[PDB]
Ligand binder design. Structure first.
Ligand SMILES: *[C@@](C)(CO)[C@](*)(O)[C@H](CC(C)C)NC(=O)[C@H](Cc1ccccc1)NC(=O)[C@H](CC(C)C)NC(=O)[C@H](CCc1ccccc1)NC(=O)CN1CCOCC1
Ligand SMILES: [Mg+2]
Ligand SMILES: [Mg+2]
Lengths: 233, 235, 240, 195, 212, 222, 244, 231
């Protein structure tokens, strides 16, 4: 039995024609206090997988260590560790999903919601979710926390089903993700302006973008709003 | 002294090889498999005439579709039978079905090598496991203390085994009836037994699909003994 | 824990520790069991090199396992107490779960199983004890007499003897006991048991113990004078 | 389980125990014997939590019978009561205690005296001339204080007992379906069939 | 549920309903509340479905092991006590069981043991267990005699379940009948309450409170 | 305080024919008022012509299916590649479920296939292992909506022969695979209309002696 | 491994004897003689101290005779250190029985349990047996006055008069000669001392080389008293019987 | 001599005699052959019988859909080791959703056998194994020895008179390695290889045992009339 202390908010993601995109802000909240601002919540595993984590940060750092140790362990007595027998997104996910469900079954969960995004060896896109309960699901778009309520509706307008994936380019997909992050900054009280974004493409590989900011915001209309009903001044 | 789980220079486990010598001292047990059923027969061998021979239990039921005969240090077989019975009933509980004869034999043979320095020594008893299932039909297995089991059309174990096995080699064919098999066990038992064969110092049993595993009465076996003697005198 | 495999096979296929446990039984005082038509009698030798004994308090050779079953033995006395205790506990445990007292066969099978367990368990030696277990099954009038030995084998006997000079008394019983017609009464069964011990014992004074068991938990031990009457009667008939 | 009574008189101990077994709004049985013979001259009645009562009684019975076989000797009522108390005293500090109250009626053959022991589920032992468990005591004790004499006969004790059962049948809320009465004396244990 | 079993001149009758509910939701109308431990022993099921199913199947395995080891049929007393001693170990853990172990042996004759999850074990002539037990008791008690014929006894058990099925909301579906003899039990059919009610109403003249 | 259980919604349906059996289930996965996936299968081919679904808490459902698939694998290893009969599978699943009697799998489990006589079979389980063979069973969120409809159309309950004064019942008969799929599709479209947790897609797994076939149909996405 | 150095203490000889038990008995046969004699109105325990030195503190010493409870005592023959391990176990066992049943432990029950412990060391554990033989002298309300003996085998037997330790063969012959059933305590005291005086390996039997104890009903009305004799009391009883 | 009482003792020349005696048990065992191309891997095994009335001892065991082995020596020891492999293959699938590499399979067997050669009380395994498989890096063939030594090979053979088949495969190396996309021809080469280890006896229908795994072929075993094609 736990209670989360230092927390990370939404993680959002989607598939496009040649790969997957995933994003998450750089904030570590301490309740209502926006305590830590340099927190990286996207963690790459190899050159073909990115694990996005929300929820308790102490448990996130534990998971980082597990993934780091997983890479080390896979390299042992493995001449093809950087080739055929390299870690796949599906391998990394199933490992975490096993751990999360074992921990919930011991009534001592890792208080997280995780999205594993990557590209398999055969070029197929991989995008799957797992949380503190051990619940797993996959979809063309996936998001955690507030992102599930506000980002998914926006991302599903681009990729509403499987057949919309080949029709969606990386330019269009990234635009939607960046737009979603702006909306979350407008409406999520535990969000920050600064965020990280990662693209895993089957051709161009892993592109990790740090220190992004929400921009092109609409605030000007606020000056016209006066009072809460009658007030004219 | 020396370790219990030691290999000889020839590549055999001393204790397993020594347990096989104990089995050669044991009373004879014979099994024959047919398309109409499997027959199991044993030499009781009472050490004294005051001993009530009907209390000598060397043929044993494992389940309705599986039977068992033994030879050697027969006291060692009790825990083997207990395990077999539990394995058979447990499988029925988990899978709502009868357990395969081969799978039962394998379960028993897993105990065999669980000794060392687990129990202190191998079993000093060999088992003939006979049964029927829907897949492989009527079967006869020979389970040793080495952990090895062979399926047999016919098999003899005990003191008169090598002489009886040579006789079974000539007599067995694929079209044997159940009645023919019953007489053949009695015939071969009478040949290798020290004392004269009768209903009190020998016991028959069988397993059929229809009626399951059955140990024969002394009255039923006595008639088969009488039928056997008449047929040999008839030519 | 002490793990050593003490009971092991030899090149010729023998377990010497089990066979040496039989030698301990052969050293022990003679014990005999004879079952009649409606009873079983357990006879026991007591060596007479021990005078100044207190027979009130000295452990008796025949032990009650339950109200309907008894157990005598030959071999190491200390070892026998362990088997008797275990048997008594199992007797009460059977009544508790099955709501019925043990059969003589079941009790024998249990004791024999304990003896066997000590022949292939690490860190232990076999029991230097052979037992004669006798009694009557619940609501049954057929007499039961079983024997066990260190190896763990057990079997039923019309009549049997164990211990020192047991081969002599077994020789006696083999010609004197008729299967077709066992001792019809209690007196006949006791007499045959006393006769068989008189082939081996020495004197019929405070050397022979007799215990008679009858159906429905009817067990009684004979006194010196009662046994002495059988001894006096047999000797007078012998001089002929 | 509800009503168990006990009366020690001059030469015997008398135990009375209700026959009803109730679960919910249904009397499942009206002929239940809430007692076990521990030894030829020792009887124990019991009442309390369902399942625990019989399980405990039989466990004690097995232990006393084991002792009798081992020593070829009958334990005194005092010795048996002490053994029972200790088992309950252990039980009360266990993970799941036996919620069982008992009366132990016995005849000591060495002293030639009857003895009645009352032991509750906590392991609280007392020797008494008369005893009860549960709500029964709230009626019977005051009644026995008045009518009981130490030199009474077994027949006088049974009449005294009838007086208790009548009072319980009059003032008790629940129908306990009468009682099974048993007597413990020098000749052992026997049941009164017509009560 | 409603389950009953009673002893009589000709052995034992066992009768149960076939309804199962999850709150007010009727999950099943075709449940087997009589479980066949073996060709000679029956067990009724009331309370937790899984608890009863699982452990009475387990009981049959233990009864089979007994007759393999002892070369004799297990007594009803010994069989019931194996189950009661088992559930007593789990006391406090939350098992929910109200069963009747019914059988016929030589030494015992026809015997019924009520066994329940809080450790109770009672021998008796008549038992009714379940949410509709009171309704069944009413018909059973008022019409029960030891000298009932096998035909009349089977009807009484059927009629008692019908009485409960009618009044108790959580009882109904169909009636399963069993007759237990020394040579084993005999199944006496599944009887849909839908058709049985109207049939009994007409032929018996009972249930006048209902519009027919 | 940490709550180890969750409700992932969805509903499933198993119908048995003469020489076939179907096991259907919607493809929607939810938590509270949110949709997690519009296509997340929960009906699986487990081998030996056995199809299985464990509906309710998805994490427990996935674990159970995973364990049963593994049970089938080891059954082959230990018993000379013997085919696991549907009845043997059912009993095995009871032991999987009851093995966690004091920390249950929060799922309603259904399996379908063919019995040893070649006839269609459906088995349904409660969360702790009580099971029963049936012609018809709906499980999950909309089971209360679908099941009485099945009673009426599959088992012909409350339907009497016209003109017979309600004396002669409508006779029971096996349905064709075509007629069964019609009932499944109509069951799910009706459940989709009136239950918020049901929709998106319908995936049916049909089992015959020839093997395991699949069929997919769209459902309303609101 | 360690198999090489294992003596195998709990095995049979080819003749069916327990090596270690036999060799433990050989050890005990060199220990100071201890005699127990049971009379109709009490029990005597007499024991010879092992070759005493003149500078040994005699009055505050305990080698042979130990108290188990108010009603039971033991005479020791063998390794004293081994005996004290067993004695403390026996003392505890007696108190467990009293705590459980609110009654003093019957003599045989105490003897059996102590003997069962010895038996265990001969059958399992791979340890050497206790090199000790006891003479138990005690009283209970069932059998009255009782004498028992136990030895390393764990076998125990009851006696009217018995000796353990050195020269038991000679000592048992002398006891068998002069013992009779209607004997009193005072007579048994005299027999015990006379027997030691003849079987002793010393030149002459003196007070400083002896331990003595009685268990009488000589207390006031129906109760048992244990008397462990003081040095001066042994000196007096030795003069009174005319040995010195 | 004085240094063969247990596995924990070294000889003066640095030898472990108990491990060598375990190796001897393999030489007494019936011959079995292993070989592979780039697309498929094949096991061929000569089964042995007690007599004409007995069955023929099964030599080949399946470990997963993509892996399995053949045995020579103590069969119960092969059952223990194959069961361990089955669990490890299975752990890799459940936890990582990943087919176990044939090379890791060998490493795991090596380490399990090793522990039994360094501790008092235990004994070495008395069996040799030929593991074949098809994983993400193509076809594989391993040779396990109970000393712990595992070796990856194109082809090999173990058991009695295994030198004959091992010589043949050493000659045929260049031919059979290029048998790609042709199962029956690769088996034929393996059947001809095991034939070089035969004396007085020939390959019959209930004597021969073949197993194959490859690109679009799960690990399957052929016995009885299914191997009559290759005689
Ligand atoms: C009469 C009919 C009523 O008592 C009888 O007593 C019958 C006896 C028959 C069923 C053998 N009893 C029941 O029907 C019994 C009532 C009951 C339930 C729970 C405890 C005590 C008594 N019904 C059940 O046990 C049902 C049987 C199902 C409908 C087949 N099962 C459930 O209610 C299950 C499991 C309940 C449970 C027991 C113990 C621990 C945990 C849970 N619950 C669900 O199915 C709920 N839902 C299933 C779908 O997934 C979400 C959870
Ligand atoms: Mg109703
Ligand atoms: Mg909607």
């Amino acid at each position: 039995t736990q209670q989360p202390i230092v927390t990370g908010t939404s993680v959002i993601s989607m598939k496009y024609d040649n790969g997957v995109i995933i994003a998450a802000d750089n904030l570590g909240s301490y309740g209502s206090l926006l305590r830590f601002n340099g927190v990286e919540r996207l963690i790459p595993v190899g050159d073909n997988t990115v694990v996005g984590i929300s929820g308790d940060i102490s448990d996130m750092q534990h998971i980082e260590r597990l993934l780091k140790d997983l890479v080390t362990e896979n390299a042992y007595d493995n001449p093809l560790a950087d080739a055929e027998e390299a870690l796949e997104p599906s391998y990394i996910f199933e490992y975490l999903a096993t751990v999360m469900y074992q921990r919930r079954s011991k009534m001592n969960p890792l208080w997280n919601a995780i999205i594993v995004a990557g590209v398999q060896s055969n070029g197929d896109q991989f995008l799957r979710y797992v949380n503190l309960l051990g619940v797993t699901y996959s979809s063309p778009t996936l998001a955690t926390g507030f992102g599930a309520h506000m980002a998914n509706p926006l991302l599903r307008k681009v990729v509403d089903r499987e057949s919309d994936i080949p029709k969606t380019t990386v330019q269009v997909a990234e635009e939607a993700i960046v737009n979603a992050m702006r909306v979350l900054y407008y409406r999520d009280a535990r969000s920050s302006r600064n965020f990280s974004l990662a693209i895993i493409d089957k051709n161009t590989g892993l592109t990790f973008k740090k220190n992004l900011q929400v921009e092109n915001m609409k605030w000007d209309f606020a000056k016209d709003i006066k009072g809460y009903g009658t007030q004219k001044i | 002294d020396r370790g219990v789980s030691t290999f000889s220079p020839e590549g055999r486990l001393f204790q397993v090889e020594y347990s096989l010598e104990a089995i050669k001292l044991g009373s004879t047990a014979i099994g024959i498999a047919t398309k109409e059923g499997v027959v199991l027969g044993v030499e009781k061998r009472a050490t004294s005439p005051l001993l009530e021979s009907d209390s000598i239990e060397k043929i044993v039921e494992i389940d309705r579709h599986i039977g068992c005969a033994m030879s050697g240090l027969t006291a060692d077989a009790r825990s083997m039978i207990e395990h077999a019975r539990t394995a058979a009933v447990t499988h029925n509980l988990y899978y709502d079905e009868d357990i395969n004869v081969e799978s039962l034999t394998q379960s028993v043979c897993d105990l065999a090598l669980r000794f060392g320095e687990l129990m202190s020594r191998p079993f000093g008893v060999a088992l003939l496991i006979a049964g029927h299932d829907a897949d492989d039909g009527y079967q006869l297995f020979h389970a040793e203390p080495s952990g090895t089991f062979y399926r047999y059309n016919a098999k003899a174990i005990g003191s008169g085994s090598e002489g009886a096995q040579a006789e079974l080699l000539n007599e067995w064919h694929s079209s044997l009836t159940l009645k023919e098999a019953e007489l053949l066990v009695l015939k071969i038992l009478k040949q290798v037994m020290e004392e004269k064969l009768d209903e009190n110092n020998a016991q028959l049993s069988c397993i059929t699909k229809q009626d399951g595993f059955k140990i024969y009465d002394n009255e039923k076996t006595a008639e088969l003994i009488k039928e056997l003697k008449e047929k040999e005198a008839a030519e | 824990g002490y793990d050593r495999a003490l009971s092991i096979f030899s090149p010729d296929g023998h377990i010497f520790q089990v066979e040496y446990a039989l030698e301990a039984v052969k050293r022990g005082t003679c014990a005999v069991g004879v079952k009649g038509k409606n009873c079983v009698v357990l006879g026991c030798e007591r060596r007479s090199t021990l005078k100044l004994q207190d027979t009130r308090i000295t452990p008796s050779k025949v032990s009650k396992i339950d109200s309907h079953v008894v157990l005598s033995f030959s071999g190491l006395n200390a070892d026998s107490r362990i088997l008797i205790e275990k048997a008594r506990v199992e007797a009460q445990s059977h009544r508790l779960t099955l709501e019925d007292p043990v059969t003589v066969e079941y009790l024998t099978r249990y004791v024999a199983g304990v003896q066997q367990r000590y022949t292939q368990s690490g860190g232990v030696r076999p029991f230097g004890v052979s037992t004669l277990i006798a009694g009557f099954d619940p609501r049954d009038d057929e007499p039961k007499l079983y024997q066990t030995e260190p190896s763990g084998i057990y079997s039923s006997w019309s009549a049997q003897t164990i211990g020192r000079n047991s081969k002599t008394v077994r020789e006696f019983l083999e010609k004197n006991y008729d299967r077709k017609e066992p001792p019809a009464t209690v007196e006949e069964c006791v007499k045959l048991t006393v006769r068989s011990l008189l082939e081996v014992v020495q004197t019929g004074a405070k050397n022979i113990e007799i215990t008679v068991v009858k159906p429905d938990s009817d067990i009684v031990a004979l006194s010196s004078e009662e046994i002495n009457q059988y001894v006096t009667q047999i000797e007078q008939e012998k001089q002929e | 389980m509800d009503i168990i009574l006990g009366i020690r008189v001059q030469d015997s101990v008398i135990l009375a125990s209700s026959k009803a077994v109730t679960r919910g709004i249904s009397v499942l049985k009206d002929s239940d014997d809430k007692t076990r013979q521990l030894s030829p001259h020792t009887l124990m009645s019991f009442a309390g939590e369902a399942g625990d009562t019989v399980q405990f009684a039989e466990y004690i019975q097995a232990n006393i019978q084991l002792y009798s076989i081992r020593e070829d000797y009958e334990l005194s009522p005092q010795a048996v009561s002490s053994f029972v108390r200790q088992e309950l005293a252990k039980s009360i500090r266990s993970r799941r205690p036996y919620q069982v109250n008992v009366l132990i009626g016995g005849y000591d053959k060495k002293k030639n005296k009857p003895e009645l022991y009352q032991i509750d589920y906590l392991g609280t032992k007392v020797e008494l001339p008369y005893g009860a468990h549960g709500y029964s005591g709230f009626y019977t004790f005051s009644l026995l204080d008045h009518h009981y004499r130490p030199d009474m006969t077994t027949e006088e004790g049974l009449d005294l007992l009838k007086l208790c059962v009548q009072e319980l049948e009059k003032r008790m809320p629940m129908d306990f379906k009468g009682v099974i009465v048993k007597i413990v004396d020098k000749d052992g244990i026997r049941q009164v069939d017509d009560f | 549920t409603t389950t009953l079993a009673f002893r009589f001149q000709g052995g034992i009758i066992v009768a149960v309903d076939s309804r199962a509910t999850a709150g007010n939701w009727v999950a099943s109308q075709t449940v087997k509340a009589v479980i066949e431990i073996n060709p000679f022993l029956l067990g009724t099921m009331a309370g937790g479905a899984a608890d009863c199913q699982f452990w009475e199947t387990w009981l049959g395995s233990q009864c089979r092991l007994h007759e393999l080891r002892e070369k004799e049929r297990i007594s009803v007393a010994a069989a019931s006590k194996i189950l009661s001693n088992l559930v007593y170990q789990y006391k406090g853990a939350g098992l929910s069981m109200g069963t009747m172990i019914c059988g016929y042996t030589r030494k015992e004759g026809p015997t019924i043991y009520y066994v329940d999850s809080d450790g109770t074990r009672l021998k008796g002539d008549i038992f009714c267990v379940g949410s509709g037990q009171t309704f069944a008791y009413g018909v059973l008690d008022s019409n029960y005699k030891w000298d009932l014929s096998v035909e009349d006894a089977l009807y009484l058990g059927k009629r008692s379940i019908l009485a409960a099925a009618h009044r108790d909301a959580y009882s109904g579906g169909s009636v399963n009948l069993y007759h237990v003899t020394e040579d084993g039990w005999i199944y006496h059919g599944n009887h849909d309450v839908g058709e049985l009610f109207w049939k009994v109403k007409e032929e018996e003249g009972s249930f006048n409170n209902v519009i027919g | 305080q940490f709550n180890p259980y969750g409700d992932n919604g969805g509903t499933i349906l198993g119908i048995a024919g003469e020489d076939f059996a179907v096991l259907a289930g919607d493809t929607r996965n939810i938590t509270d008022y949110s949709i997690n996936s519009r296509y997340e299968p929960k009906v699986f081919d487990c081998g030996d012509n056995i199809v299985m679904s464990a509906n309710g808490f998805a994490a427990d459902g996935d674990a159970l299916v995973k364990r049963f698939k593994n049970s089938v694998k080891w059954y082959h290893f230990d018993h000379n590649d013997k085919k696991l009969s549907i009845n043997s599978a059912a009993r095995n699943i009871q032991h999987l479920l009851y093995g966690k009697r004091f920390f249950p799998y929060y799922v309603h489990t259904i399996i379908a296939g063919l019995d040893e006589d070649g006839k269609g079979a459906v088995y349904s389980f409660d969360p702790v292992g009580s099971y029963e063979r049936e012609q018809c069973r709906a499980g999950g969120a909309a089971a209360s909506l679908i099941m009485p409809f099945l009673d009426n159309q599959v088992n012909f309950k409350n339907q009497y022969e016209p003109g017979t004064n309600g004396k002669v019942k409508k006779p029971l008969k096996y349905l064709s695979v075509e007629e069964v799929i019609k009932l499944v599709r109509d069951s799910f479209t009706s459940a989709t209309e009136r239950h918020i947790q049901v929709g998106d897609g319908l995936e049916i797994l049909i089992v015959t002696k020839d093997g395991v076939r699949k069929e997919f149909y769209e459902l309303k996405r609101d | 491994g360690s198999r090489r150095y294992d003596s195998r203490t709990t095995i049979f000889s080819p003749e069916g004897r327990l090596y270690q038990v036999e060799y433990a008995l050989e050890s005990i046969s060199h220990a100071g003689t201890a005699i127990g004699i049971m009379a109709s109105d009490g029990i005597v325990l007499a024991a010879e101290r092992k070759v005493t030195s003149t500078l040994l503190e005699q009055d505050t010493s305990t080698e042979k005779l130990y108290k188990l409870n108010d009603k039971i005592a033991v005479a020791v023959a063998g390794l004293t250190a081994d005996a004290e391990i067993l004695i403390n176990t026996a003392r505890i066992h007696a108190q467990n029985y009293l705590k459980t049943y609110n009654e003093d432990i019957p003599v045989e029950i105490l003897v059996r349990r102590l003997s069962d412990i010895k038996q265990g060391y001969t059958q399992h554990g791979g340890l050497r047996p206790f090199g000790v033989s006891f003479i138990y002298a005690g009283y209970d309300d069932r059998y009255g006055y009782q004498l028992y003996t136990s030895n390393p085998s764990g076998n125990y037997t009851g006696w009217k008069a018995i000796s353990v330790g050195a020269n038991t063969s000679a000592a048992q012959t002398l006891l068998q000669m002069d013992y009779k059933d209607d004997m009193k305590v005072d007579d048994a005291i005299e027999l015990a001392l006379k027997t030691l005086s003849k079987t002793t390996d010393s030149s002459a039997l003196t007070y400083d080389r002896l331990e003595f104890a009685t268990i009488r009903k000589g207390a006031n009305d129906g109760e048992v008293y244990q008397k462990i004799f003081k040095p001066q009391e042994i000196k007096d009883i030795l003069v009174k019987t005319g040995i010195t | 001599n004085n240094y063969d009482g247990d596995t924990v003792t070294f000889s003066p020349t640095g030898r472990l005699f108990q491990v060598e005696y375990a190796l001897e048990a393999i030489k007494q065992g019936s011959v079995t052959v292993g070989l592979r191309s780039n697309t498929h891997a094949v096991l061929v095994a000569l089964k042995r019988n007690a007599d004409e009335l007995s069955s023929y001892q099964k030599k080949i065991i399946k470990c997963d859909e993509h892996m399995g082995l053949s045995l020579a020596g103590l069969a119960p020891d092969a059952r223990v080791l194959s069961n361990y492999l089955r669990q490890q293959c299975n752990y890799s699938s459940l936890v990582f959703n990943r087919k176990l590499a044939v090379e890791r399979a060998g490493h795991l067997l090596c380490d399990k056998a090793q522990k039994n050669t360094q501790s008092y009380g235990g004994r070495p395994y008395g069996v040799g194994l030929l593991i074949i498989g098809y994983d993400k890096s193509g076809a594989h063939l391993l040779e396990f020895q109970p000393s712990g030594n595992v070796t990856e090979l194109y082809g090999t053979a173990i058991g009695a008179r295994s030198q004959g088949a091992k010589t043949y495969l050493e000659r045929t190396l260049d031919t059979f390695i290029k048998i790609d996309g042709n199962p029956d021809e690769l088996i034929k080469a393996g059947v001809e290889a095991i034939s070089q280890s035969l004396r007085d006896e020939s390959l019959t229908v209930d004597n021969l045992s073949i197993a194959i795994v490859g690109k679009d072929t799960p690990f399957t075993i052929y016995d009885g009339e299914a191997v009559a094609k290759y005689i």
